[PDB]
Design a protein around this nucleic acid. Structure first.
Ligand SMILES: COc1c(N2C[C@@H]3CCCN[C@@H]3C2)c(F)cc2c(=O)c(C(=O)O)cn(C3CC3)c12
Ligand SMILES: COc1c(N2C[C@@H]3CCCN[C@@H]3C2)c(F)cc2c(=O)c(C(=O)O)cn(C3CC3)c12
Ligand SMILES: [Mg+2]
Ligand SMILES: [Mg+2]
Ligand SMILES: [Mg+2]
Ligand SMILES: [Mg+2]
Lengths: 487, 245, 487, 247
DNA sequence: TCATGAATGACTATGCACGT
DNA sequence: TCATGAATGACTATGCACGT
């Protein structure tokens, strides 16, 4: 029996827990804004072909595929993570197209795994765009059977767009969601002004990213908290729902709430007000009725007494309920395997850097493949010029090894190229078929030269990021939901 | 008029209308379906009571055991009327009781169990036409450009598909025609536009003609006597298709 | 609103339920002895490649695949069905190779889906043998997306081997498991004496199938019940566990129970003995101790009082506990979509019929494919005989169609053969490869001759079933477990 | 000294042993229902008892005492050990002289260990001081040789070593089935658990030692306490050097 | 004291037939 | 009354950090 001191054990074990939680579970990678479970689910769905170009697959298959290959944890909590990514009131830009009952903003829970189907959304397809062209580092999974991505290409700034909330050890993150078009403008400026320092860059980006854009709409009151979050990495953003005063035929007045601030449970909100009236604390209120439906959306009617002022009761609601509540912004994300609190310019810059890395790596991969194709084509072209000899050579060979060794000597060709000649179909010997090989070589060499030019010119690389992102924003960008007002 | 909860079952999502005459109770199979139904309903006139699991066979089970059953209590308490001799239709809290189960065979089975409960404990609800059966959709035709259509049978699916194609409409051969294998697979909108919107919903009103003939049939199908049920099935299953010909 | 009478609704709905439960759920198909969920799990694992030639896949993947493609029901009960097929105390011949905690014969439950892995067993591979050679009818699944098998090839008599218990509507099945070697002998006799009438066949098969062989070993007392089951389709078979009296050093005697009858929960059994002493109904018993372990198996020690006779206490145990308990055999299975109670000769015959159907269908499929391959090979040989001419023709063609149309003209060829020539690689123009094509034609024509011979001779067909089954039994057959004793 | 074991006033989840002698008795505190179920099957029921713990154990450093005592898992531990807590601690009433904490080799198992050790150090410290607390080291790998008996490895290094030696010895492994990797106790069956963590002739146990009580107290309060700031600075200070604690 | 969300599944009740 | 076995998922408690 080996002895171990309790201090050594405690320190070693808890640090090991704290670190993996920080860098491997609870906090988003700055580059794609994803936690490991999110990334593994999406790639699992992606690799399984559960894409918007095909019908929704049973969500159990996505969970099972994630479990068996990438995420060595329980099916239940994995399904919860998948579900959340399909809720329009949770994610500003849903990554999962959910079919069935995925719950509500209230206490209505999502249906069980068996009842729901799911597939990736178009934007999630941009998260994974060209992941198979060595655009991101892959590592072996939890048992080494297969490979998994360390990070996704993330061809749109998902961290800032969808935000992130996470409780780790010793620290936590709480990044709000933002409008894609505004983020795009910030990225476009960052690309054009690639030499601008942090001071200038922060000023530019803050001018374009006016503030967070919550999926639940509502209101942002004030500007200081937003500024603090972007300049410090921490700030308190005051959120409000929308209230519209209605009058009655009798002359009675009622407050109609049609929006609530981000992450306010609708049923808890109604129950809170109810409890805050049944025993006083919100006098002036006469009746609370939830006239909500799938067709009219949120609609909480607050009938008030004749001897009551509308704004007084509204101000009381702001004070004593989550009709007005603040978002505790804390811009914490993993950067190069280290947790870091980031300014807005840093968040933009780190993402732009990732995009450039993606585009260069993609270009490198395409350039390598282009050369391989060109290499073999050159081999075929040589065979065609001496086709009479090549065929006679192969025919007179007792084996294919003899033929291959001969081809190498005949045409002064590599073994890979000679292998391609041998694998050539009789189809490819037709007049027009011989011609396409020639043209294809001419086609590729132009492509090779183009790719080389891209790698040689940072300007083109930045231009590609801009143009490709612009295409995404034009297609998948939407209007602002949260309205920003002054004090 | 009767008070709605805002002393009733915890699972009950009651309506807002205080008038039973205008009120409706959707007795739903499963938490999922009941959950989405609660969202797609008209909260003014429509209440939801989800039932979980197979309902207890009141024909087989002893009386006291039935009264212990949480799901039966939920129904009896929600309907407001008593049971058997203590039944009072004056306390009926919903003049429309819609049973909504899956189109599959287990949904059919649950219907027979619920109908058995009603016929044995609260027969006047059937006699006075307060009991209805919702017919869920089976297919959803998702046209590329046109609004989606719902089909409640294989024949209707074939017909609507034919008409649409003839009219020049087109469908994806991947997404295509979504087939519903249960209410639980539907979202709030789909349920509203097929089973709960009073302007398009397909309800069937349960009528009771011969009480004595109904009584013996219930006793045969639901009773403890297996032999009688066995011979009845082997005798009549052969001709189940030809009941409405 | 349409009116419907309650009698109409009740009768239609309940009959529809009863018939689906009877034919689609609770009761086994006579040909493979499988219920729908079993068949769908197994084929799901099979198609997914979860076979013995690969490591165990996470069981969640088997559940999800079954659920998503074939079985429109819940993940939980499906997992339970998969688990049961992996338990050596449930199935006489397990069809699932389980890895992890799959529970015990006692009250110890199986581990959750997340913790376990699973793959098909070798015998289960015999259930599915050559299913991809059109040996069984396939139908569209529950949404028509894919095809599923109506029945498995079942190359060993699985219904009798593993048995079946099922509660339907208006009826229930309870077929006990049997010894594979004994079933094989019956099948062999049925094959040899293929014209024997039912009386002779029942006599012959009853002589070879000595009785049920339970995975839990134990004892069968008497012969009447077994005979009744085989002759009538209904019978009460008395089972017993194994008791071994031990005399202690100090002087006390104790009963050691090392085996229990089929489907007797160990923990319930101990609890039953205990509780019938707590009240006081099994006097003579002094102490109950469960010395069972993973290494010695079941071992329940019942120390008895000194003024007590061991045989008396054992007989009291037989009467008042499940140490002695009866198996209510009811040989009910689905035959041609109809529920039927079957004699033992009928069960064997129906299985043999299914095997002959499988082999004939397999032969037909192989003959069709063999003809196609030969058809193309005949084309290839013609090309080789006139090889110089073939190439020159393809060269001068503006398209491949002109080259094709010419090949038809040159060698009098189909479009398939000419297309096959077109798809030919230069690899096969080497000497040995040309000879390989020649020999391959000779080989197929020889195989075609063999295949034609099989179809024309029932004798060979019966021979195939016998020999193939014999190979399976020699490899996967085991000793008898349940001992048969007289009164 | 002897005490009665439950057989048809102790926790329902407890699978007690048969031996009434605490000096010879052992309590395996197991992470999870699955693992606890397998342990219950692979154990030696004579001397080894199983108490499965479900979910993360409540932090007795953060939570107030009344809430800790209402926690079902803590109650199970306190009741199973038989000893009281704090001032009412009486080692004479200890029902097991070996308390084996058996958690997953993974990160969450380590976390549970610290929570259990926190409970013990705060409520029942003498159990640690007197060497009644042990840590079981689960296997990580199972090498399945084609013809030879399978081997277990408790580290990546040992896996590499046994693989090399076996191959050098002429043995062979399937490159498909091959080396099974355990991701937790729940993935193991009864036999595997016996032959790696419960067989006293093969198991790898670590005995928890307590040297400096004052230093331990401080470390416990820092890592487990309510003060986040102290914990954050400690982690950022010392996580850099965790690899080099035993070099 | 409550919410967040990514981690660490057993229990609970019925239908159905048949034999104790 | 209980066991059999395929059918019809929500509720329950902790860690972790942070803000009202
Ligand atoms: C049995 O642990 C859990 C509890 N219980 C823990 C407590 C102590 C024992 C008595 N019950 C309470 C509630 C719970 F309430 C929820 C979950 C849960 O959701 C979950 C998951 O995969 O999502 C996994 N587990 C298990 C991995 C431990 C849960
Ligand atoms: C809520 O229904 C279930 C119960 N409850 C039903 C009762 C009424 C309400 C209060 N609870 C009791 C127990 C249960 F105990 C077990 C299961 C179950 O195992 C299961 C499965 O897929 O395996 C599926 N379901 C659901 C699909 C119906 C179960
Ligand atoms: Mg959970
Ligand atoms: Mg259903
Ligand atoms: Mg279940
Ligand atoms: Mg673990």
């Amino acid at each position: 029996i080996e002895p171990v001191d309790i201090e050594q054990e405690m320190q070693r074990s808890y640090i090991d827990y704290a670190m993996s939680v920080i860098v491997g579970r609870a906090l988003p990678e700055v580059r794609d804004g994803l936690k490991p479970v999110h990334r593994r689910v999406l790639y699992a769905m992606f690799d399984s072909g559960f894409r918007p170009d095909r019908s929704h697959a049973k969500s159990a298959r996505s969970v099972a595929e994630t479990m068996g290959n990438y995420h060595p944890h329980g099916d239940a909590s994995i399904y919860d993570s998948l579900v959340r990514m399909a809720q329009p009131w949770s994610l500003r830009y849903p990554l999962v197209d959910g079919q069935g009952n995925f719950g509500s903003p209230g206490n209505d829970p999502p249906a069980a795994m068996r009842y729901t189907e799911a597939r990736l959304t178009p934007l999630a397809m941009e998260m994974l765009r060209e992941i198979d062209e060595e655009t991101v580092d892959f590592i072996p999974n939890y048992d080494g059977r297969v490979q998994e991505p360390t990070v996704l290409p993330s061809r749109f700034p998902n961290l800032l767009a969808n935000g992130s909330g996470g409780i780790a050890v010793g620290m936590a993150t709480n990044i709000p969601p933002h409008n894609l078009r505004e983020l795009a403008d910030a990225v476009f400026w960052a690309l054009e002004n690639h030499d601008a320092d942090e001071e200038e860059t922060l000023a530019a980006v803050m001018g374009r990213v006016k503030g967070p854009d919550f999926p639940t709409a509502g209101l942002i009151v004030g500007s200081q908290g937003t500024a603090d979050a972007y300049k410090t990495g921490r700030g308190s953003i005051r959120m409000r729902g929308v209230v519209e005063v209605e009058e009655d035929s009798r002359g009675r007045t009622s407050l109609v709430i049609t929006e609530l601030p981000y992450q306010v449970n609708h049923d808890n909100f109604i129950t809170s007000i109810a409890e805050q009236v049944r025993d006083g604390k919100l006098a002036g209120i006469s009746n609370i009725e939830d006239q909500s439906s799938d067709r009219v959306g949120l609609r909480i009617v607050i009938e008030i007494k004749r001897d009551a002022v509308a704004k007084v009761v509204i101000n009381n609601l702001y004070k004593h309920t989550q009709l007005q509540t603040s978002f505790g912004a804390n811009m914490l994300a993993i950067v190069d395997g280290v947790p870091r609190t980031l300014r807005l310019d840093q968040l933009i810059r780190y993402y732009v850097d990732h995009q450039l890395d993606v585009i260069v790596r993609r270009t490198t991969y395409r350039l390598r493949k282009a050369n391989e194709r060109a290499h073999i084509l050159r081999g075929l072209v040589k065979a065609l010029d001496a086709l009479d000899e090549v065929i006679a050579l192969i025919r007179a060979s007792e084996t294919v090894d003899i033929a291959r060794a001969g081809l190498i000597e005949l045409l002064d060709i590599d073994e890979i190229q000679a292998q391609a000649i041998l694998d050539m179909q009789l189809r490819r010997l037709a007049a027009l078929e011989r011609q396409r090989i020639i043209d294809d070589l001419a086609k590729i060499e132009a492509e090779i030269a183009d790719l080389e030019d891209i790698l040689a010119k940072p300007e083109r690389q930045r231009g590609i990021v801009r143009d490709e992102l612009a295409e995404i924003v034009d297609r998948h960008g939407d209007d602002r939901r949260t309205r920003i007002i002054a004090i | 008029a009767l008070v709605r909860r805002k002393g009733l079952p915890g699972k009950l999502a009651d309506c807002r209308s205080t008038d039973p005459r205008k009120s409706e109770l959707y007795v739903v199979e499963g938490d999922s379906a009941g959950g989405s139904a609660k969202s797609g309903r008209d909260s003014m006139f429509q209440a939801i009571l989800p039932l979980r699991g197979k309902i207890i066979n009141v024909e087989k089970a002893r009386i006291d055991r039935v009264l212990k059953n949480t799901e039966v209590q939920a129904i009896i308490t929600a309907l407001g009327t008593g049971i058997h001799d203590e039944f009072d239709i004056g306390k009926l809290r919903y003049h429309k009781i819609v049973l909504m189960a899956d189109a599959d065979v287990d949904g059919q089975h649950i219907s027979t169990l619920l109908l058995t409960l009603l016929f044995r404990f609260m027969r006047p609800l059937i006699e006075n036409g307060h009991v209805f059966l919702a017919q869920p959709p089976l297919y959803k035709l998702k046209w590329q450009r046109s609004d989606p259509e719902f089909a409640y049978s294989d024949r209707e699916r074939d017909g609507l598909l034919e008409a649409g194609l003839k009219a020049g409409k087109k469908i994806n051969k991947e997404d295509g025609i979504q087939r519903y294998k249960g209410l639980g697979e539907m979202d709030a909108k789909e349920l509203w536009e097929t089973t709960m919107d009073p302007s398009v919903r397909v309800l069937r009103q349960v009528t009771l003609d011969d009480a004595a003939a109904a009584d013996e049939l219930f006793s045969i199908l639901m009773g403890e006597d297996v032999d009688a049920r066995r011979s009845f099935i082997t005798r009549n299953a052969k001709d189940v298709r030809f009941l409405d010909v």
